């Protein structure tokens with residue numbers, strides 16, 4: 633149950649989300665990534681930002697060792713963090729990811745974000761007044777360094793995340809482009825369905841990958857607590873009753889039937905195993921139109937530090 637990418641590799645259409653807030657002990661990511669594999673997730677999504685690549689890497693290593701899977705059965709994504717956009721920092725960033733995970737290669741490596749930040753050992757570099765220090769980088773050059781990581785076999789596929797159409801076009805129109813981004817991983821759910829972006833992405837044979845597909849984790853520090861709760865949506869709850877499923881499964885299935893590859897995070901065994909049931913049922917053309925009408929341009933993520941960034945994608 634894969635999609636063929638534009639470089640000929642295959643990505644599983646259902647992916648496991650590994651991010652958990654810092655208050656959750658790091659042992660949890662190891663433990664739940666094993667459960668995710670046990671349930672049948674094969675695509676696993678992490679990043680340098682998440683401070684869990686060692687644990688996720690270990691879960692994978694463990695499931696290979698006990699004979700459940702082979703390395704080739706797992707699709708593992710990491711991401712280049714915005715402090716490492718300068719071309720000379722790209723390969724070392726990857727190699728560090730790979731060393732932490734104890735993998736020889738990632739299946740996919742992404743530019744996490746078009747919003748470049750000051751290089752250093754901060755994830756969040758801030759100045760004397762506590763303001764985030766942006767950097768200015770020509771992402772066409774970051775991308776060239778991404779291309780070299782593919783050629784070096786360190787990343788089987790390369791793509792982007794949190795890019796808008798104009799940012800995508802910059803890469804696509806780049807002179808002497810060797811590799812198109814296979815995908816653009818973006819916030820995508822019935823309250824922000826990204827239909828226009830999706831259609832553009834389809835027209836360039838770029839896969840849209842949905843994150844916060846279940847309405848985000850509603851982390852107080854980035855998400856307005858007054859924002860509507862996606863899984864409480866009446867239309868989604870009603871379709872959950874119709875189909876004898878859950879509103880999560882409605883949200884995930886939605887994405888699969890519109891040709892979006894969809895991530896789902898859960899650190900609960902029960903919901904991890906529930907989420908693979910997305911494959912067991914089908915929404916009707918009308919159910920899909922019902923969900924289409926829920927769009928409200930609601931992005932769960934906010935930092936008005938990041939709205940001022942010249943590369944802020946929602947411009």
Ligand SMILES: NC(=O)c1ccc[n+]([C@@H]2O[C@H](COP(=O)([O-])OP(=O)(O)OC[C@H]3O[C@@H](n4cnc5c(N)ncnc54)[C@H](OP(=O)(O)O)[C@@H]3O)[C@@H](O)[C@H]2O)c1
Pocket residue numbers: 648649650651652677678744793794817818842843844845846847848849863878880881895896897898899900903904906907
């Ligand atoms: N590229 C990017 O910038 C970016 C940004 C954000 C996220 N991501 C990736 O996308 C993944 C998913 O996004 P997300 O972290 O925003 O979370 P999400 O997939 O939208 O899930 C949000 C919440 O839904 C709950 N949930 C999961 N399955 C459920 C079910 N069957 N029924 C009811 N509730 C359920 C989970 O809680 P429990 O854990 O309690 O089950 C989870 O905290 C991330 O972990 C990360 O890998 C990427």
